[PDB]
Amino acid sequence: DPFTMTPSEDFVVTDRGGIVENSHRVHAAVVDAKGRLLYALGNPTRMTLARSAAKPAQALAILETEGVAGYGFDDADIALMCASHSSEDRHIARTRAMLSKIKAEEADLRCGGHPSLSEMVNRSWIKQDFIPTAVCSNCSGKHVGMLAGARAIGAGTDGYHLPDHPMQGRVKRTVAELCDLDAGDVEWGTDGANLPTPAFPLDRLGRIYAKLASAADGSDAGEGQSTRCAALAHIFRAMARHPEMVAGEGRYCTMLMRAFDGALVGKLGADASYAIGVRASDATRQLGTDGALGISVKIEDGNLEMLYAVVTELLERLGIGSPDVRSQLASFHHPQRVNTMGVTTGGVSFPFKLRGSVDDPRLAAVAR
Amino acid sequence: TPSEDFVVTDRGGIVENSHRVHAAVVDAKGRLLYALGNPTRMTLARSAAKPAQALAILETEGVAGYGFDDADIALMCASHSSEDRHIARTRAMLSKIKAEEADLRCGGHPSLSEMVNRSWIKQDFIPTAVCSNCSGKHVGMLAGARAIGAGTDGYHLPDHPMQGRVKRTVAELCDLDAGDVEWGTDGANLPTPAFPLDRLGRIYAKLASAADGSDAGEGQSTRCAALAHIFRAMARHPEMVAGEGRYCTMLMRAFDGALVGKLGADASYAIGVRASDATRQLGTDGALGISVKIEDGNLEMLYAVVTELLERLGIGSPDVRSQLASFHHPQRVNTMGVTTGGVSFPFKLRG
């Protein structure tokens, strides 16, 4: 029944010859630069672990640490602070170069190695029986930045990753401020790189990225900016200018940001969250706002392949990009379902319904 | 109305992911005894259908003369890890029917075992037909095609008499009309069935009930004798059904003949349990079947949920189920060795 559809029915579905295989619940928030909710799927205020999608906020805490500017980190270094990189040789090399800029060593890192986020890098490692180390961590740029901040303020570098260290105090305050939340409304766990990692309502992730894009708009327009806005604009520019540092070859975040050529930044969070900050455009004005826009997405069950398909579908429904721009992402939008003998067996579909654009006022949209 | 039954992962007590669970526990006639979620969800059984496909093979006139043994039949029932021993038995079965790898109509794929696949990657190995996790099923279907003098070139096609026999056998074991079983195509390019989840449990209840009847000396039909043989082969050679470290293998070794279990791709699972003190305590005088589907397809959550279900149902002892402890509560340890989270089962079995 099309007239009683509900957020609880916002799904992405795979089929085999039209027979339902798996279904996945979708949550999404589309917000303006003040965080006002414009469109939604599912529960747009779902309490959600932002995971690596919080990295631009952590990079802001690093860059706002007094004395860090003296080290001379460049745009590509800042993009690596914002990264879940593929541990390609260039990412490892830049990690070592950043360590040298602050006169630190690999032994000072408090993150550990892991199989590469890229299948192609991991195959190269498997062939050589290579055991990844701390400098290979996908979070290595963030950790070097945290070490840099600890050094700059005269804190111990031992324990820079611990919650009671001033660098983590700065991270926690900065995240809550960008979300416009009280501290008690942000919850904290520990991530794979052994750092505090925040959870907050999903729409506030979109809000962080709308603020990134809004700051970039203000910088480009030559507006006088606060130190924080200037730093957010710098983070946006660094990500857009060096998207290969943010992920790597063949990675969604990199291909997305290259396709859009400065129009937006995007960032993956582990267990299938995603965030995009969109500079003001004809597309954002058609969506009903006079400034920048933020988008955040969570697949409830954590499936990454479905995440990238949904994010690409959502950009199409929001009219962001062109068919030609979004077509660089076609392999993510409709994932291949080809069996071992080259026969297509099924596909992906998107039975979810954006709300916010309509319906009988008696139709309740219960966030679920 | 189906309950809202979930398995939930957390990071420091904060919800990470949640996964909807469907499950059916049925008696030997398929009557529903316990459920999670929607126990009749229309579900692609995928490889959990392989014992029914093995039955169609074993019931084919002339197949007995090839001399397939228990380990061969276990391989027909397998989603194996493509270990060297699985490939070697595939080749040995091809030799029994005087066929070649080129006669197979399945293709190679990365191993279901990450350890095997890493070993292949290190050695630049390109898997071929004989490495398919379904290779034993395909040899069996080739064997059946040969046995009745049908063409072998298209034994995998829907209009071939081997697939006619498979389709009829699946619906008969489900106790469904032909029109109530839907069909797609699987990764190995064979027809693969969808039917209500509880009927998958019914198939495995019939497997275990047949083993109970053969064990007790009852006048069994030929079909029941064949089902008992399939159960015996899987429980005797569980390493052929999956492989080292695989859930199905560790599950069946732990239970030492008390049950058989089988994975279906995209996170279905089926178990047939022979009558026991545990099944009698559950209120049935015969064998039992269990089938599970994780709605979003997550395998790690599947194995955690199945093990939690065995615990709720009292199936096995604590000591026996502790062999599956690593699947029941999967590791959540970061790159520096710190535990960051866990898994929870806020569902409740309804009876």
Author numbering:
A (entry chain A): -3 to 353, 357 to 367
B (entry chain B): 2 to 352
What does the paper say about this structure?
Asparaginases (EC 3.5.1.1), which split L-asparagine to L-aspartate and ammonia, are grouped into three unrelated structural classes: Class 1 (bacterial-type), Class 2 (plant-type), and Class 3 (Rhizobium etli-type). ReAV is a homodimer with an α/β protomeric fold, formed by two tightly packed domains. The active site of the enzyme is located in a cleft on the protomer surface and marked by a zinc ion with an unusual coordination sphere created by Cys135, Lys138, Cys189, and a water molecule. The conspicuous catalytic center of the enzyme comprises two Ser-Lys tandems (Ser48-Lys51 and Ser80-Lys263), centered around the curiously hydrated Ser48 residue and located in the close vicinity of the metal binding site.
As in the structure with the C135A mutation, the absence of Cys189 triggered a collapse of the metal coordination site and the C189A mutant protein is unable to bind the Zn2+ cation, as also corroborated by microcalorimetric titration of this protein with zinc. The mutation induced slight atomic shifts and structural rearrangements in the active site area, but these changes are not strictly equivalent in the two subunits of the dimer. Alternative conformers of Cys135 were found in protein chain B, where the major rotamer with refined occupancy of 0.8 retained its typical conformation and points to the Nζ atom of Lys51, while the minor rotamer is rotated toward the Oγ atom of Ser133. The hydration pattern of Ser48 is similar as in the WT protein, with a water triad centered around the Ser48 hydroxyl group. However in subunit B, the Ser48 side chain exists in two conformational states, with the major rotamer, with refined occupancy of 0.7, directed toward the Ser80 hydroxyl group, and the lower-occupancy rotamer pointing to the carbonyl O atom of Leu264. The pattern of H-bonds at the two lysine residues, Lys51 and Lys263, is practically the same as in the WT protein. Only one conformer of Asp187 is visible in the electron density maps, but intriguingly, its side chain points to the main chain N atoms of Ala189, Asn190 and Leu191, and not toward the side chain of Arg47, as observed in the previously described C135A and H139A mutant structures. Apart from the interaction with Arg47, the sulfate ion forms H-bonds to the N atom of Gly188 and to four water molecules, two of which belong to the hydration sphere of Ser48. The position of the sulfate ion is slightly shifted compared to its position in the D187A mutant structure, where the sulfate ion is bound right next to the water from the metal coordination sphere. As in the case of the C135A and K138A variants lacking the metal cation, the mutation affected the oxidative state of Cys249, which is not oxidized.
